[PDB]
What does this fold into?
Amino acid sequence: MFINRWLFSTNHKDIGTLYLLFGAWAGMVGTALSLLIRAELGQPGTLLGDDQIYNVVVTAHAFVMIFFMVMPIMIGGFGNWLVPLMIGAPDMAFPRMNNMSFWLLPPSFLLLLASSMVEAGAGTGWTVYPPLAGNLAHAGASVDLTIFSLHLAGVSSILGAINFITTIINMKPPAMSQYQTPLFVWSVMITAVLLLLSLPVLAAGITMLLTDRNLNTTFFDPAGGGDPILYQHLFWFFGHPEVYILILPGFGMISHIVTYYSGKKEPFGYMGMVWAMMSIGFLGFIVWAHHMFTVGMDVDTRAYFTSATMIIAIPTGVKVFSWLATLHGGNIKWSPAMMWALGFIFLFTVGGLTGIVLANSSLDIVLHDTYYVVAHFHYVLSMGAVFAIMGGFVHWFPLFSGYTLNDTWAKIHFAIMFVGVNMTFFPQHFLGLSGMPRRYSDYPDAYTMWNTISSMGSFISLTAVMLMVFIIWEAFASKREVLTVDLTTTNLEWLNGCPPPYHTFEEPTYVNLK
Amino acid sequence: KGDHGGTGARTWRFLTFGLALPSVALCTLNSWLHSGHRERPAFIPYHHLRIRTKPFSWGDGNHTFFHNPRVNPLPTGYEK
Amino acid sequence: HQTHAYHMVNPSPWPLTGALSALLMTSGLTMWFHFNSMTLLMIGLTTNMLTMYQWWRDVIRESTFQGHHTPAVQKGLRYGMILFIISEVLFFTGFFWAFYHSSLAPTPELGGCWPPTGIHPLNPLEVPLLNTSVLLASGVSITWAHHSLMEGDRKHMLQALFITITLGVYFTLLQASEYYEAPFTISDGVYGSTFFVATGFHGLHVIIGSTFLIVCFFRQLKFHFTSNHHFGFEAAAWYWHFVDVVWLFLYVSIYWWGS
Amino acid sequence: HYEEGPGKNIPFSVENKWRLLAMMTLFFGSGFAAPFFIVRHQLLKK
Amino acid sequence: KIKNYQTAPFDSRFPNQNQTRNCWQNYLDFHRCEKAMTAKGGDVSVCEWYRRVYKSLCPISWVSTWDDRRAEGTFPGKI
Amino acid sequence: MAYPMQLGFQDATSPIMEELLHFHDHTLMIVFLISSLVLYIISLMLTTKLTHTSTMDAQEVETIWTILPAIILILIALPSLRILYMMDEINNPSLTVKTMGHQWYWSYEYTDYEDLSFDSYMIPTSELKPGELRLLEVDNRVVLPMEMTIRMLVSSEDVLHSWAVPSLGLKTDAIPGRLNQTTLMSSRPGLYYGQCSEICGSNHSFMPIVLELVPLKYFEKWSASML
Amino acid sequence: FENRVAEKQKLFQEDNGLPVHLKGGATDNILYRVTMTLCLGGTLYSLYCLGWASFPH
Amino acid sequence: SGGGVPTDEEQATGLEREVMLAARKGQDPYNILAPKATSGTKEDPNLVPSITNKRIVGCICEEDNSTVIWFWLHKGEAQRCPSCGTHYKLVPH
Amino acid sequence: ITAKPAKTPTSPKEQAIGLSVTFLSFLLPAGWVLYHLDNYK
Ligand code: HEA
Ligand code: HEA
Ligand SMILES: CCCCCC/C=C\CCCCCCCCCC(=O)O[C@H](COC(=O)CCCCCCCCCCCCCCC)COP(=O)(O)OC[C@@H](O)CO
Ligand SMILES: CCCCCC/C=C\CCCCCCCCCC(=O)O[C@H](COC(=O)CCCCCCCCCCCCCCC)COP(=O)(O)OC[C@@H](O)CO
Ligand SMILES: CCCCCCCCCCO[C@@H]1O[C@H](CO)[C@@H](O[C@H]2O[C@H](CO)[C@@H](O)[C@H](O)[C@H]2O)[C@H](O)[C@H]1O
Ligand SMILES: CCCCCCCCCCO[C@@H]1O[C@H](CO)[C@@H](O[C@H]2O[C@H](CO)[C@@H](O)[C@H](O)[C@H]2O)[C@H](O)[C@H]1O
Ligand SMILES: C[C@H](CCC(=O)O)[C@H]1CC[C@H]2[C@@H]3[C@H](O)C[C@@H]4C[C@H](O)CC[C@]4(C)[C@H]3C[C@H](O)[C@]12C
Ligand SMILES: C[C@H](CCC(=O)O)[C@H]1CC[C@H]2[C@@H]3[C@H](O)C[C@@H]4C[C@H](O)CC[C@]4(C)[C@H]3C[C@H](O)[C@]12C
Ligand SMILES: [C-]#N
Ligand code: CUA
Ligand SMILES: [Cu+2]
Ligand SMILES: [Mg+2]
Ligand code: NA
Ligand code: NA
Ligand SMILES: [Zn+2]
It folds into this structure.
């Protein structure tokens, strides 16, 4: 029974639970890697005495946090648990293929571990650019194991995208149009379309890297007429959609959380929120070269990519202002999930504004490959994603488990994390403006003060992560079972009780046309 | 060109046997008529060709997967 | 008892065996490229084939033999196959991007020209044109097969599907011979790299598509398809037209314009 | 069928809170410890 | 002709950030010119402008590799 | 170079970097307008027990909050693009200098007249002379004439690197097989520091750039003495 | 050939509680055990190879 | 042409065949169609079939509303949408 | 939300034990590795 249920699953809730457990474990790995980064930088000099190892830690930090923590939690965990419930569907369209999307991830993560254990690791950056990642500067198996890890994670997510698009298009009640589905469901559909289109381009690029390393191709090698910059275009043609894939489900969850704890039946400006996510999805394919402003790019191309990148703040702003308009007039409930969502709005706004600074290619010349970029994305993406994940985890933990958290402990956890992440990343703006490069294991002495503060911040967030594990333990240890949940008339995922039965919507909802 | 009414099974069989397979037969003629080995060019050890940055994982490491001794020189030239 | 039309699938081991097959194929390729051993790779290829066989066997059991493919389920499988094809188009787009990048701006090491100095392309009017006629003809014959099935005609469906498969096999054998006869190789700089990786992945998809047509041929021999319900045949035909269209873009781009 | 309800729709037991603490300790502690041991491993090769 | 040479001037054929083809073209031009002069008897001095431009722009290792390949018979450009 | 506790950009050494500072100040004035506006508005939404939970009509306010951001973006874009096209303007250099990245050092070639080239490596910490800067000094500085337009050409003989000098607003990737051009003009004599800015392996943190800007006549005699 | 789909429909609809991947009979169980043994055995072997390759030789 | 290809009438089975036969009779036991609303007064409530004693209703109170209002409808006296008041009555079994 | 009182209440002492064990599970192994870094180097 245990194997049938948990290794042979065809159930969207159990698969969602598997993804949440996997993603929480990966988040411990990715946090430990981030603390090694900050320990190496927390005083001047060398800590590891091996900067190849430092570079391997940085590279694996980003792959773990992106491919094994955020994407599995947002899309595999919250998407599988919540999407079918929010449309009244009995499961996903392809419930068995869904289980393979999950089970490809432990082997993908094993390949990434393997890459770091063999030879000297892949000390490449998560961009994996050649020729550093080629077979002369990274001879041996580490980079190929990293490529294969990415291939498996890509297949997992492409099949998952197929599943989500199909389920959301085909399995709603017959009377429910796409403009009657909740915003989280929209955010997953759009994320899935971005995955479907972008991950095959990454797969092509990393396969060309694999063949340059092992089959004597020269896609990226000038000796054969190849070009390192071609790899960067293929990588970033995926990688820009990827940053929106990482945040879009978070936007969906934030819309639900802000609406719920405002005591509202609906988000402000629903169609504008759909418009904004669709626009971000579409424009997310035409801006990638802003990751390449220093490669030797012609001025008119720089001007185009600057302008297209600026156009994206418009639909993103409709979403920030619409979250503020949802709060307006609300019966505000200061629950821990609401605190996470308000933290998200603040931090995402800070990070999006420093992205606007970066969009100007002339300023980006001076800021590229410095800690100002690291500060932009740890606000707008890394901590935007983590605060939306924690808001959604706190808000929906009683649905998934049937038990309540201790809200006082959850508010203490939020307070510690908010101090920690701001102490960690805010000073990195100053480091970047004053010229400290990213991807460095040590720094000229002038940069000591802000690196020291940033590293002390990183230990505050460690304390918060340890406390989060205790908080989850205390909830399962005390077994406070949920009774009543407010606002079920506009939050269908709760209407089957906590936790919902294994099969839900065996009799579908009744929705008429009128 | 013409019919355009029903595109049914009978029309698609008519197109298969009346246009598609005759085309394949004509191109098969055209090909098996220009076939016949052509003189291999002087070997020149150009550096952008016969790339070897890592031995191939088969054979002696130095032969491509569908190596044809008649027309594929090694980095050192044609085989004897 | 359910009162919706969707399919709750029995708990299955094939997702796990497929995931493990992917681990074994990739760790196997690593072992082959770096540790001079084919052992893991051969295990992974075997378990991958076993997984595909049993998973798709079970889908036939669920549909032809158990009746779980209601119109709603079939509609989801249509979207799933269309979206899968879209992802494969974007995979090829990356290799077309590589090809145009390198051939539109040939670097000094090539001689600053395309085709590079020392490269002697195949004549596109010889076997490449024959291959084009073969795949176009197979798109006509598969359309005959489809209409025969819809019209209830077993014999002509089988004849037309057999002709389609024969043409797919003809393309594959012609392409294998062209690979052997080509004077340039995958190691012949970016011309060889783009040519063999892009045509090579295309050839893989021709083999996959031909295999799928063969599955459909044997299912047809066993009377699985009705004149109105035969989504495996439709999916194989859509995949086969995708393989044809990818070939037309390779022929125009790499063989013709790139000569 | 399968068990349903709180504490039953999860692949780990919560019947005993102290056994649960041990299991959660090993689970999250193994993920957090792994990078430190990988670093140790790489340093010990030099 | 125009001597007072400080460095290679702006060339509208190569207005952008990648100047690889500028180096390459002047190297080819100098060597084509040199060939035409040393053969038809004349003076390579008429080739001098291309020499100065490619020597200004081209990395030493590129020039050295290209010279080695011309000697070996493996230079892939046309001279 | 940066100094301890610095918050913003290094002081400008070239007119282009001065332009960037003024444009960054402009962008920041706007950034601080938007940030404080958001903070003030969100705080307002969160500080009343008055409620209004019925459906709210959206279209009017969505016009305000699309059109205002679009106007702001145009107010950033216009000076941004002017600086971009100004940095692109031909300036007629007096000198061309190449730099080749390597793991892990830079080489320099000054081949307009004579065959002058040398390598430039970080001074190890144990060998710094008293008062020299850890991780920033080199053995052989890039001596250049002050007050003159210089074309730098940047490439690499192995992996990617990136040649950067923040106080001159310069960062140009060094890519094998590619010759990237940038121009440099220092308004002042002195020593201007940068660091390799594309991860290139284990010693990426330790291959810095030091420009030494002096009058032409001293650059000429230095060049001759380096042959 | 003859249409024997009805016989297979009867077989795969028999009310015997078997999941679809085993409902054909004992051959399914054999093929399943072969596949799972190769997968789990191969996975252990891959872990062995990782152990081997994690150290210099 | 010739024959030899089975029809759905001959060979469809299981749930597919159930849906096909019900459609011929104009019935929708597997909920493939959206039900059409009545006037929804207490005299003419919307009639909600169920195989049990409760079913979830979603009410799109006005055409084009993006918010759906969801509630359990139980066997017994008709209930009203909590947003618009339109009436629904469960018709079990 | 409303909920039942805990089925198995976790007293302040029990929470101090769970918190201490949780923190030690993260701190002791990493602390051992970092304390011994120079030994590895
Ligand atoms: C969640 C992930 C995420 C998201 C959403 C974003 C969103 C944005 N990013 Fe960021 N970015 C990253 C993750 C993300 N980014 C990562 C990981 C990298 C580096 C990758 C690497 O190199 O490793 C990076 C790097 C990166 C660069 C390259 C810098 C460099 O390498 O030198 C640039 C350049 O333009 C950029 C810009 C932006 C912009 C303009 C947005 C916009 O989408 C933001 C829009 C949001 C707002 C603007 C705020 C809300 C709006 C209002 C309140 C309205 C009014 C506003 C105005 C009028 C301006 N990003
Ligand atoms: C989602 C993405 C993500 C996240 C979450 C993080 C989190 C952190 N990052 Fe991240 N980081 C990157 C993505 C991310 N990073 C990327 C892409 C790079 C660039 C790599 C390269 O240059 O190639 C990078 C690089 C980078 C650097 C620069 C390295 C260099 O340039 O040399 C630094 C430096 O301080 C840093 C620090 C941190 C810290 C201290 C944290 C965290 O410790 C902050 C606090 C957050 C947590 C503690 C998260 C906990 C969440 C969980 C545990 C999940 C729980 C799950 C459930 C409840 C279900 N990161
Ligand atoms: C370097 C080498 C790396 C190698 C990595 C290899 C990784 C993976 C190993 C793959 C093992 C495959 C095993 C067979 C999978 C069959 C999936 C399938 O066919 O899934 C179907 C859905 O997807 C559909 O249709 C449409 C989708 C069909 C997808 C079929 C599988 C494709 C796998 C690879 C494709 C990747 C994309 C490449 C382009 C980037 C059916 O869905 P189920 O939920 O099962 O059933 C639903 C029931 O109602 C059916 O009666
Ligand atoms: C090293 C490489 C390893 C080998 C690679 C793969 C080799 C060959 C695989 C060839 C693919 C065979 C697919 C067989 C599918 C059989 C099952 C099937 O066709 O199932 C049909 C449903 O379609 C379905 O799920 C459709 C689902 C199938 C989608 C398949 C698409 C191909 C995917 C192949 C993987 C590609 C990866 C490429 C990466 C470069 C059943 O419904 P119907 O037909 O309506 O019948 C019911 C009627 O009888 C009722 O009256
Ligand atoms: C169902 C689960 C299946 C698990 C299967 C487990 C397989 C266990 C046997 C492993 O066999 C290894 O394969 C290697 C292949 O590399 C051999 O290397 C040898 O053979 C190679 C091939 O030429 C060369 O590397 C050398 O000759 C030599 O070291 C080596 O002797 C042998 O130990
Ligand atoms: C970034 C994540 C890491 C964050 C901070 C970790 C905080 C430290 C927790 C304590 O860790 C322990 O510290 C002891 C020292 O206090 C070590 O004992 C060591 O030192 C002792 C005292 O000298 C000896 O008694 C022991 O045998 C010797 O192992 C012990 O091994 C280690 O487990
Ligand atoms: C027409 C469409 C859907 C309306 C509906 O059917 O409910 C609405 C939804 C969001 C609207 C857009 C957003 O509100 C954002 C923009 C607001 C500007 O005031 C007009 C253009 C603008 C781009 C709007 C155009 C149009 O009214 C949109 C696109
Ligand atoms: C035996 C069978 C009759 C089918 C049936 O009604 O059972 C017939 C009808 C169509 C025939 C096939 C088609 O005519 C196509 C092929 C024609 C080749 O000449 C022989 C094999 C070939 C594949 C045939 C084999 C066999 O004779 C088939 C399959
Ligand atoms: C952001 N890109
Ligand atoms: Cu050289 Cu970084
Ligand atoms: Cu981007
Ligand atoms: Mg860079
Ligand atoms: Na350090
Ligand atoms: Na059809
Ligand atoms: Zn209503």
